[PDB]
């Protein structure tokens, strides 16, 4: 099946909807989920990326998360993420605002939430191929590994956590 995605304009409304192939080829600005999912004891659950993904394949995400599908709610969405990418379902969400990013490939507004889970997870092998718990401190010692998106995320997280 298709998947169909927001496009939003400048001040983030929606005003179009594009298949995710068309969002990708002419890097449109569309919204996403960032979760900082922690262990509530100084450590993120952190993700590597595949190296078939389209965005930054084989980068660590600091946050689970993903495009928001048209016409979804903020937090449906990001439950939705959280659920496909790690198997997690019911555990309390935080909000924590919204950040836009721009880089060469991509164009977000994106929503902040966390979570407490010390697991069990259930990943997708096709999308991250592997996870570990790291500090702060640890992710900062290895930034240049991570998607800044999800970087940028995790600080916002950090400046308020
Ligand atoms: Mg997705």
Redesign the pocket.
Known sequence: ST?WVDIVNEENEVIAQASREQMRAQCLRHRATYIVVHDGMGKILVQRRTETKDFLPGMLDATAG??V?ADEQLLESARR?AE?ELGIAGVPFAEHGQFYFEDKNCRVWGALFSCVSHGPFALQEDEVSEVCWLTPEEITARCDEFTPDSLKALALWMKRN
């Open positions: 998947e993903g495009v599908q993420e496909e």
